[PDB]
Design an enzyme around this catalytic site. Structure first.
Site, PDB file in Angstrom:
ATOM      1  N   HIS A  62       0.823  -1.247   0.000  1.00 29.32           N
ATOM      2  CA  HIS A  62       0.000   0.000   0.000  1.00 29.32           C
ATOM      3  C   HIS A  62       0.842   1.274   0.000  1.00 29.32           C
ATOM      4  CE1 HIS A  62      -0.025  -0.131   4.609  1.00 29.32           C
ATOM      5  NE2 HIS A  62      -0.172  -1.451   4.338  1.00 29.32           N
ATOM      6  N   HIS A  92       6.265   7.112   5.712  1.00 29.16           N
ATOM      7  CA  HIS A  92       5.815   6.665   4.392  1.00 29.16           C
ATOM      8  C   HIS A  92       5.162   7.858   3.731  1.00 29.16           C
ATOM      9  CE1 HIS A  92       2.389   6.181   7.091  1.00 29.16           C
ATOM     10  NE2 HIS A  92       1.703   6.635   6.017  1.00 29.16           N
ATOM     11  N   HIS A  94       1.971   9.101   0.688  1.00 32.21           N
ATOM     12  CA  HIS A  94       0.814   8.886  -0.182  1.00 32.21           C
ATOM     13  C   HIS A  94       1.044   9.786  -1.395  1.00 32.21           C
ATOM     14  CE1 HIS A  94      -1.247   6.918   3.217  1.00 32.21           C
ATOM     15  NE2 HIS A  94      -0.523   7.805   3.973  1.00 32.21           N
ATOM     16  N   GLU A 104      -3.493  13.363   1.279  1.00 33.38           N
ATOM     17  CA  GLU A 104      -4.658  12.922   2.060  1.00 33.38           C
ATOM     18  C   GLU A 104      -5.336  14.112   2.705  1.00 33.38           C
ATOM     19  OE1 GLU A 104      -3.299   9.436   4.433  1.00 33.38           O
ATOM     20  OE2 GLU A 104      -4.317   8.402   2.747  1.00 33.38           O
ATOM     21  N   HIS A 117       4.097  11.101   5.928  1.00 31.22           N
ATOM     22  CA  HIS A 117       3.656  10.800   7.297  1.00 31.22           C
ATOM     23  C   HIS A 117       4.810  10.195   8.095  1.00 31.22           C
ATOM     24  CE1 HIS A 117      -0.753  10.461   5.826  1.00 31.22           C
ATOM     25  NE2 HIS A 117      -0.320  11.758   6.022  1.00 31.22           N
ATOM     26  N   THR A 196      -5.090   6.616   8.573  1.00 27.87           N
ATOM     27  CA  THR A 196      -5.789   6.796   7.280  1.00 27.87           C
ATOM     28  C   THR A 196      -5.840   5.513   6.484  1.00 27.87           C
ATOM     29  OG1 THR A 196      -3.860   7.468   5.996  1.00 27.87           O
ATOM     30  CG2 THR A 196      -5.056   9.219   7.228  1.00 27.87           C
TER      31      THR A 196
HETATM   32  O1  LIG Z   1      -4.835  -5.148  11.064  1.00 29.08           O
HETATM   33  C1  LIG Z   1      -4.023  -4.583  10.101  1.00 29.08           C
HETATM   34  C2  LIG Z   1      -4.570  -3.956   8.991  1.00 29.08           C
HETATM   35 CL1  LIG Z   1      -6.256  -4.050   8.754  1.00 29.08          CL
HETATM   36  C3  LIG Z   1      -3.797  -3.320   8.045  1.00 29.08           C
HETATM   37  C4  LIG Z   1      -2.429  -3.345   8.195  1.00 29.08           C
HETATM   38 CL2  LIG Z   1      -1.446  -2.637   6.933  1.00 29.08          CL
HETATM   39  C5  LIG Z   1      -1.826  -3.959   9.285  1.00 29.08           C
HETATM   40  C6  LIG Z   1      -2.637  -4.584  10.242  1.00 29.08           C
HETATM   41  S1  LIG Z   1      -2.044  -5.466  11.670  1.00 29.08           S
HETATM   42  C7  LIG Z   1      -1.710  -4.188  12.865  1.00 29.08           C
HETATM   43  C8  LIG Z   1      -2.284  -2.919  12.754  1.00 29.08           C
HETATM   44  C9  LIG Z   1      -1.877  -1.933  13.638  1.00 29.08           C
HETATM   45 CL3  LIG Z   1      -2.547  -0.365  13.501  1.00 29.08          CL
HETATM   46  C10 LIG Z   1      -0.935  -2.149  14.613  1.00 29.08           C
HETATM   47  C11 LIG Z   1      -0.377  -3.394  14.704  1.00 29.08           C
HETATM   48 CL4  LIG Z   1       0.869  -3.632  15.868  1.00 29.08          CL
HETATM   49  C12 LIG Z   1      -0.747  -4.446  13.855  1.00 29.08           C
HETATM   50  O2  LIG Z   1      -0.207  -5.672  13.880  1.00 29.08           O
HETATM   51 ZN   LIG Z   2      -0.043   7.658   5.895  1.00 31.37          ZN
END
Ligand SMILES: Oc1c(Cl)cc(Cl)cc1Sc1cc(Cl)cc(Cl)c1O
Ligand SMILES: [Zn+2]
Ligand SMILES: Oc1c(Cl)cc(Cl)cc1Sc1cc(Cl)cc(Cl)c1O
Length: 258
Positions: A62, A92, A94, A104, A117, A196
């Site tokens: 992404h 990162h 966007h 964004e 960001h 986001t």
């Molecule tokens: O649950 C996730 C989603 Cl839907 C999207 C991405 Cl790119 C990563 C994850 S796992 C996750 C998300 C957050 Cl904000 C913090 C941690 Cl420590 C995670 O493993």
């Molecule tokens: Zn971002």
């Protein structure tokens, strides 16, 4: 059929897996410069990046993340609207398919070519995964990119993107200095918001710098050569990886400057 930025899995679909997408403190937002209130009680931001330890650059499907060692207080954000100490974990961007879109956040509905960001977590919560569960867990410094003169401090990033073209690819990325990505002024807007990207958790104090950085057309053209897909899969250029502005709801955007 996971989330992304396509017609079939893009931001308008996210609420089906992540109902917080329609929540009360979603990001990004349009910054109405005339409605933002100068808050003389805000402090100057303290960006302490001299001991920053970059480790790796990853294409996660992404965006690309430049990751830092956040096991000690080496690269920290403090001050401004923040209570306590926030450790840099990654940055990162966007960006758009064309220079007229990509950011964004917007400023009086203006879209910039891209948005950086710098993601930091509040040390009182011990680790990033705990911090994203708290309403004051993260502080994200957002910086707009406009196309003009090259940004010298971005070129080491641009130069390695050919080595992480596809999802899941990473490269060593040591000794990178994030101070080279900052504008001259640290004047900012701040408001409470969210990640986001899914899971869209409402854990972020946003700090969006007023002054954009300038990057060259060649620099942002190299972002647009990345791929959302994995190696050996049909090529889908990594462009337009931005979520559009969300409703402000019951929020006030504060300005650090008069
Ligand atoms: O649950 C996730 C989603 Cl839907 C999207 C991405 Cl790119 C990563 C994850 S796992 C996750 C998300 C957050 Cl904000 C913090 C941690 Cl420590 C995670 O493993
Ligand atoms: Zn971002
Ligand atoms: O050193 C630089 C000069 Cl003279 C001009 C610009 Cl616009 C960027 C730099 S930083 C840099 C970037 C990469 Cl890819 C390699 C090296 Cl040896 C650099 O110094």
């Amino acid at each position: 059929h996971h989330w992304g930025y396509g017609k079939h899995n893009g931001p308008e679909h996210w609420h089906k897996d992540f109902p917080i997408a329609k929540g009360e403190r979603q990001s990004p937002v349009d910054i109405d410069t005339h409605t933002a209130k100068y808050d003389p009680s805000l402090k100057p931001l303290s960006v302490s990046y001299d001991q920053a330890t970059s480790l790796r650059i990853l294409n996660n499907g992404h965006a690309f993340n430049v990751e830092f060692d956040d096991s000690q207080d080496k690269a920290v954000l403090k001050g401004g609207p923040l209570d306590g100490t926030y450790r840099l974990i990654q940055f990162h961007f966007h960006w758009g398919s064309l220079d007229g879109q990509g950011s964004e956040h917007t400023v009086d509905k203006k879209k910039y070519a891209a948005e950086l960001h710098l993601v930091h977590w509040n040390t009182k919560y011990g680790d990033f995964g705990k911090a994203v569960q708290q309403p004051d867990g993260l502080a994200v410094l957002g910086i707009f990119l406009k196309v003009g003169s090259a940004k010298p401090g971005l070129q080491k990033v641009v130069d390695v993107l050919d080595s992480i073209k596809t999802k899941g690819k990473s490269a060593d990325f040591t000794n990178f200095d994030p101070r080279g990505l900052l504008p001259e002024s640290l004047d900012y807007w701040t408001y409470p918001g969210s990640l986001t990207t899914p899971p869209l958790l409402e854990c972020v104090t946003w700090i969006v710098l007023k002054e954009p950085i300038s990057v060259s057309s060649e620099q942002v053209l190299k972002f647009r050569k990345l791929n959302f897909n994995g190696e050996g899969e049909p090529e889908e250029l990594m462009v337009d990886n931005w979520r559009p502005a969300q409703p402000l709801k019951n929020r006030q955007i504060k300005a650090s400057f008069k």
